[PDB]
Amino acid sequence: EDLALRPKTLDEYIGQERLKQKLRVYLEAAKARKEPLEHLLLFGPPGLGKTTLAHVIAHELGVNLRVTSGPAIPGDLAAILANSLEEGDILFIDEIHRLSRQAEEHLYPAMEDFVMDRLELPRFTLIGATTRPGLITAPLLSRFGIVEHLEYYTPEELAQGVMRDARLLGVRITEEAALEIGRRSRGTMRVAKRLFRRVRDFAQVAGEEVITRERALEALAALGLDELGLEKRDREILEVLILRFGGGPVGLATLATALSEDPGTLEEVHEPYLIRQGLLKRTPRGRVATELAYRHLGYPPP
Amino acid sequence: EDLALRPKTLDEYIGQERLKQKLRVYLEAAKARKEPLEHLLLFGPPGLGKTTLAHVIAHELGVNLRVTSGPAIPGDLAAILANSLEEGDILFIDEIHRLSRQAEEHLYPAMEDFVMDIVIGARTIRLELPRFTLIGATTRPGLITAPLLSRFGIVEHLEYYTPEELAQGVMRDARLLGVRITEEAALEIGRRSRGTMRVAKRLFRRVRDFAQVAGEEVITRERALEALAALGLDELGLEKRDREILEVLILRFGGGPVGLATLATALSEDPGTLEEVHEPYLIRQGLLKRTPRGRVATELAYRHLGYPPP
Amino acid sequence: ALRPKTLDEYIGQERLKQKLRVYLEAAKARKEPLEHLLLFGPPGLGKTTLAHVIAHELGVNLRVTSGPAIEKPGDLAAILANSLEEGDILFIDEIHRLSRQAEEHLYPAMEDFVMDIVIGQGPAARTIRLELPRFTLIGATTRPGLITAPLLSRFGIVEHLEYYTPEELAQGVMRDARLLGVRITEEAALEIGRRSRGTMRVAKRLFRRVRDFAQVAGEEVITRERALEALAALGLDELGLEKRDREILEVLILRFGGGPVGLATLATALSEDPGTLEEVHEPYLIRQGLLKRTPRGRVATELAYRHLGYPPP
Amino acid sequence: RPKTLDEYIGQERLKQKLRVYLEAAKARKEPLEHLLLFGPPGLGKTTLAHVIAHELGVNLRVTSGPAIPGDLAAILANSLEEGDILFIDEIHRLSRQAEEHLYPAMEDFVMDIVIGQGPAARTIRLELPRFTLIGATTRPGLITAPLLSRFGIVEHLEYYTPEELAQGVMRDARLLGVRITEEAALEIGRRSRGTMRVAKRLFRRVRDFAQVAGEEVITRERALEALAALGLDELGLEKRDREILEVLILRFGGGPVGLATLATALSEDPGTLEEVHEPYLIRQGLLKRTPRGRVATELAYRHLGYPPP
Amino acid sequence: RPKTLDEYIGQERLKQKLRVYLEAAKARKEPLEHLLLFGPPGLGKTTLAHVIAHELGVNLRVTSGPAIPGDLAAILANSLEEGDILFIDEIHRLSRQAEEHLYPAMEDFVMDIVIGQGPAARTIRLELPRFTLIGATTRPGLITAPLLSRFGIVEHLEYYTPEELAQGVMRDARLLGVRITEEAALEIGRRSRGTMRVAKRLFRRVRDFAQVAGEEVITRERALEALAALGLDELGLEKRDREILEVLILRFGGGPVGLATLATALSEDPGTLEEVHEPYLIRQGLLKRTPRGRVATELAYRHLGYPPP
DNA sequence: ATTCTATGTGTTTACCAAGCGCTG
DNA sequence: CAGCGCTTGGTAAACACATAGAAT
DNA sequence: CAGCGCTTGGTAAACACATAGAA
Ligand SMILES: Nc1ncnc2c1ncn2[C@@H]1O[C@H](COP(=O)(O)OP(=O)(O)OP(O)(O)=S)[C@@H](O)[C@H]1O
Ligand SMILES: Nc1ncnc2c1ncn2[C@@H]1O[C@H](COP(=O)(O)OP(=O)(O)OP(O)(O)=S)[C@@H](O)[C@H]1O
Ligand SMILES: Nc1ncnc2c1ncn2[C@@H]1O[C@H](COP(=O)(O)OP(=O)(O)OP(O)(O)=S)[C@@H](O)[C@H]1O
Ligand SMILES: Nc1ncnc2c1ncn2[C@@H]1O[C@H](COP(=O)(O)OP(=O)(O)OP(O)(O)=S)[C@@H](O)[C@H]1O
Ligand SMILES: Nc1ncnc2c1ncn2[C@@H]1O[C@H](COP(=O)(O)OP(=O)(O)O)[C@@H](O)[C@H]1O
Ligand SMILES: [Mg+2]
Ligand SMILES: [Mg+2]
Ligand SMILES: [Mg+2]
Ligand SMILES: [Mg+2]
Ligand SMILES: [Mg+2]
């Protein structure tokens, strides 16, 4: 029924250790003096645990959470702040970058002092989660007390997440299988959950009841994933670059035409992970395959 | 009658073996747990069977399917999601990339958790949607935002077809239309296609027109070859313009690096037309190379044109 | 000006006419609408007249529309759902000018003959699939590279218009004179066609100017000499070159010896932006064989030497 | 909420023909013709619409006149199946723009929809399923001739009787769990103005009096003292209407008076006197509207126990 | 909430002349010429406006650019007194309609008022008292030449030194009742970016860390440990800016990169990188913006402990 | 209901630089 | 071996198109 | 004394002017 298995306690939250230290310090300090938290902002690549952390913060402060969104919302944002906002409650605006300039101009004046345009608003904390903080206007971006950045997870944390999701769903999986699924993940929790669900479907169709390590490996091979998590399309991109063009500078148009691919999807979907993993370089004369790409595909380095 | 005859079941779908070997597993697993399929994205070059596969998936699941177009639809998408969604029904959007960047933000909270953020009036309220499936087919996945592209549970790529699969498609279309055709004629039409099902159907229709005008009743191999030669297609599907491009490259410029503007002006052709209409298939077949110093004709071009290698 | 009404009156595109005749006959025999057609080529070759001729041959109606005319998808929906009957032909000139949002509304309209529209304007908005009659779309464009690949793959028949031989331009000029009441001879028409650049509209323009010159000269029949004098007055060589192209060739032959000159050096010598010399003057010179592009520079061919009355190398 | 036509209280004359029309429509497997229901306010035309829809076995689309021009297309194209029923309460309040968009959809079942929106864009004609439309207006005058011309069946809602009002009071008492005798409900219905809302309100007030009195059953007499304490006659006039008649008869001799002088005498707003109290003084034969003023009829003299003029 | 010019923290260069202008205007019993305050955002121009108003002894009317065209007329008519100060924060956001209504009120103290609400109607010229208008903006570019020409005094706000930021931190600590030493406040001010809000926020974070540690006094070592736990460098660069510099220098060799490639390498939004992290990397000499991409200067190499190019 | 203004986004265009061959 | 010429590729800066929020 | 002529007075029904509202 539910596949987005969100943890509810900060102890169930897994991977953001250096963020968790500061968050625990701030939350203990705010609870010690019976004072509401400062305004908080979360940003990072998609799928890393912004909304989950907002809900966990709401639970840990022990108050209610009022969830809204930027696309959902100028004259509207002045209503939720007073109509259904209690003292100490948290207002969570997910995807806050989409919020209008006029709507933003009616939000930060109510952030420094809890009054609008007098009407006394109760003590409240604003939590904003977005992928593009650069779209938030400087006046609104300057009244955020805490600004935090979400980092990529290590394979062990991804394995822990896979095991927890398996236990909640009711699937018997081994430590090594979860480690393999986490290793093949792209440092992202959502990718790990998706890969685990695909392996679960493969095992269920095959009739297996326990996902042993070899069963996980064969399921991932059927999915078409390397030891680095590369799909078939990424491997084909690297192979075309190495063979058809000698691995030297190519360019976006030439490489896209050779691969029967759109240049935009080659540049904004497939390339970033190869660049992160060190299998590709964006030389000013074009794209270049690194020695790691040569050795990963079983080719003699130049 | 109809010219876009689509298969209805996964058995009639012809040549996506690698994709089907996993799609069958996913559908069987979804049916076993009595749960709808996780969200799906189909992408690839035009003419390979994305919309047909979406309809086939809808038929296989047994649930209804609602068709939407990406260019058709920011706040509207909330209305379409809320008004006309039933538990298990598949929602299908073609050209999902054409959705504005503001209109996918509304799809963000309704794909991982099935609850929407809407404002009434009062204040903000949360509308809980039924457990549905969204299928999106697009040729440019790089125009879909990263969060939405991450919300998709299953992402698949449509690859090209072998000549035998194109021949099977031609035979199926012929038996559906009411035209008799030989195995070898269908194989020739498939070989002259550019690995695309739409191209194969179009070539078959042109050959049928030629044979019907000529008065022939059964399209044999010889009649098919005559019709294809009348169209002006080689054994690799090259037209006359492609042969002209290769001949001018080999003869006038010596086959070496030339460039785009020079080669286009030597042809009295627009360079954009040359690079976007004729060049990609020549590159795919191996008859042309985009070297850093210009366009170069490969040895395959020399052998195909019947010219001595340099 | 004057439009032919049948495929026999259409002057001089033989391979296209041979390909098109069988398609038209087959469509007529099967009592079915014709496949979608795309006509592309350089301007002035007769795309719109071919569309009208095809519409007359099929015996159906023709609705003419322009690419920039359709600003919004609502206009396209109104045209497709109301103005068109079963088997009618809708002609869009300069398809590549269509906006991509409106260009992508045509994929279902041409493949499935259904159109997806959102109506309701608020919380009551919902999607409808307007059914469409089995119409036919003919599209004319000069820049096929600006048409999206899914759209270009949906055209059943795609054809290219070629330049006219001087004899065909002479036949067109003679037809225009006969339909206009003039008494031009064959040699004058052939000369007017030769000075043309393989285009019909320029041939008609030149014939009309020669007619004006001859009429004010008092002659009742346009002889070859009168046509030559009128064309020289208009400023055209025996190959149709203007004065600017002629002086470009003169400068290249003299100031640089006719050898590899390069684009920048020649442009500076001629005091021209090398974005006008390359795309307005060079293409026709290369077409006529008067100029050659070399990895070292621009080379004037021997035919340019002979045409300009200069000694051979 | 009644469901079948036999559960409806007291529209016997209308129900007799409604049964025939509905049976004939069902036998042909064809949607019923468009229906218009006239009647004074307070008689329950929406309940009759619901009963008709249930009898036909078809869903509803309820909408009032002043609801939102273009929303008519939305409501017609969103949730209308084959033979669906659309009920437009207060159909004389529709705007002229919204009125000149419905009769195409009544005579031909085709609606023109604005598709481009925004600036002056084009429209498309769209086909709708065959449907029946029920209209309910209390002011037939504001219904234009073209709008009235497209309605196949036109019927009138008449005032109830003391017995049907008594049945309604019994139904309400049974729903609320209050014990009431037949004659008490008959008295309550008699003192109502042939309207269901008035009968229910009177029953609730009598219930309050009886409950305060600590009585477990409401009999005839207890209803009588409750209605006497409410200040009501055997005809339904309050103390204010009796005061109006007595002022008209005694102070002015019953002759023509005029709105301003009578209102000044009664210390009441002239509009309040004209639009709240007078309409039931008329319709009972107790008052007249002469061009020279307001006159009291002989029925007013008889009712108040005064000697005739 | 500072009140007088002596209580203001650190605009020594501006205060030295502002005191003279205020004294000269006060001695003449005449309001001072309209003043325009330039400066980067976050430096506190509204506090200086309040201080100026208090020193002149007149009332202040706070207004912003997008306040509501006719609201300017109201604020100029009703709430202006002889010598009153009208402060318009964010004055380059003022609409052109309100733009071509304020310059007659600055050069002649007369304004036209629309009297016929509704249709076009007519206007009447009205006389205003002699007042001073104080404008504040961060972007001088959007100030048109006619608007800039009518300001008698134009002055610039500049970034504070670490010592002035330390004084502000001490004032905030005293207001909040937290004991902090001289050197700790100096370190907090040094690790800020010449802005008061940054210093206050850093002080609050150090306060949270010290309170969790259960320390009654924030000394120097506690401040240094807290600011190290925040990933702050001696220049105030966070971990993300140092990572940007490291990626630019190591992965790309420091040469031109471009926004898209660098953002892809950092897994960041290009607009986020350009508008939130780059501006302080510049202005410190650690980054350059070439037409061929972004380049790391020698200061970046020296700062990160890397060998020079 | 139309007009106008803004902002955010998709698409195109104009430098600028680097590299390979010829050169004389 | 030191200009001259052509050819590719990427980076930033313009356009042009929409929506939405505005007043009239 | 029984029409004819005038003079007053009140009652209801029209106008005409505003606002507000809505797209
Ligand atoms: N520490 C964690 N433990 C368990 N699950 C986690 C954790 N962090 C993230 N997730 C999972 O990450 C998934 C998606 O991330 P969310 O927390 O829902 O929001 P988000 O990741 O910010 O969204 P996007 O699409 O990446 S912008 C959820 O299904 C969570 O279960
Ligand atoms: N596997 C298949 N079996 C049978 N017919 C097929 C198959 N794949 C494609 N076709 C036919 O090919 C034609 C075009 O295929 P589509 O799926 O409509 O195009 P597409 O894949 O959606 O690409 P576009 O233009 O980007 S939407 C239709 O007539 C289909 O019936
Ligand atoms: N004949 C009836 N039988 C049963 N319940 C009725 C009847 N008439 C009205 N009601 C009740 O009246 C309520 C609905 O209001 P109605 O009085 O039906 O509206 P209406 O008849 O249109 O009155 P007006 O004049 O239009 S406000 C419901 O509780 C019905 O049960
Ligand atoms: N120099 C200063 N001396 C004392 N308090 C100051 C000073 N600068 C700012 N403040 C405090 O800052 C608060 C007012 O906000 P400011 O920071 O002054 O707004 P601002 O000066 O306009 O900065 P920005 O860039 O416009 S957001 C009050 O609490 C003031 O006490
Ligand atoms: N084959 C032909 N026979 C006769 N006239 C022609 C022929 N081709 C072109 N023309 C004439 O030349 C002109 C070309 O313009 P038109 O065909 O309208 O647009 P385009 O510039 O796209 O060709 C027309 O006026 C037409 O009369
Ligand atoms: Mg986002
Ligand atoms: Mg598509
Ligand atoms: Mg054209
Ligand atoms: Mg009513
Ligand atoms: Mg500001």
Author numbering:
A (entry chain C): 2 to 74, 77 to 120, 133 to 317
B (entry chain B): 2 to 74, 77 to 124, 129 to 317
C (entry chain A): 5 to 317
D (entry chain L), E (entry chain D): 7 to 74, 77 to 317
Quote the study on this structure.
We also incubated RuvB with DNA substrates and 2 mM ATPγS to assemble the RuvB-DNA complex, which was further purified by gel filtration. Data processing in cryoSPARC resulted in two maps with overall resolutions of 2.97 Å and 3.20 Å. These high-resolution maps allowed us to build atomic models of the RuvB-DNA complexes, denoted as RuvB hexamer and RuvB dodecamer models, respectively. The RuvB dodecamer is formed by two RuvB hexamers in a head-to-head manner with approximate dimensions of 158 Å × 127 Å × 127 Å. The RuvB hexamer model resembles RuvB hexamers from the dodecamer with minor differences. Notably, a feature β-hairpin in the NTD of RuvB is invisible in most protomers of RuvB hexamer but is well-defined in all the protomers of RuvB dodecamer. In the RuvB dodecamer, we observed interactions mediated by the feature β-hairpins of RuvB, whereas this feature β-hairpin interacts with the C-terminal domain of RuvA in S. thermophilus RuvB. These interactions, which are absent in our T. thermophilus RuvB hexamer, may stabilize the conformations of the feature β-hairpin in our RuvB dodecamer and in S. thermophilus RuvB. Moreover, the overlaid structures of our RuvB dodecamer and S. thermophilus RuvB showed obvious conformational changes with respect to the feature β-hairpins of equivalent protomers of RuvB. Together, these structural comparisons suggest that the feature β-hairpin of RuvB is conformationally flexible, which may be critical for its unique interaction mode with RuvA in the Holliday junction complex (See section on asymmetric interactions with RuvA). As such, the RuvB dodecamer we obtained is not biologically relevant.
